[PDB]
Amino acid sequence: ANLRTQKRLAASVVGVGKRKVWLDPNETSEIAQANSRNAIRKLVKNGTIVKKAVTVHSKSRT
């Protein structure tokens, strides 16, 4: 359907911004039913959604 509700919610429930939420490309028949907020914490613990790690800006040459 249209997951632009859930990718907005998954920054507010996690704490990282919007651009770091990795939703699931295979379970969109299930993520689209997590309308309210307190079902997203039933999915982050399930691993349907994963916070991507911080892109590295090393300082080693500096």
Nearer to RNA, 32 or 42 (CB): 32
Q: Which of 13, 44, 55, 60 binds RNA (CB under 7 A)?
A: 55
Q: Nearest 5°: phi and psi at 2?
A: -155, 105
| CA 21 from centroid of its chain's CA atoms | 3
Give the number of residues in contact with RNA, rule: CB under 7 A.
25
CB 55 within 8 A of CB 20: no
Cβ 43 to RNA, closest distance in Å?
13
- Both tokens of 31, joined, read 């993520």
Binding site for RNA (CB under 7 A): 1-5, 7-8, 11, 16-25, 28, 35, 52, 54-55, 57, 62
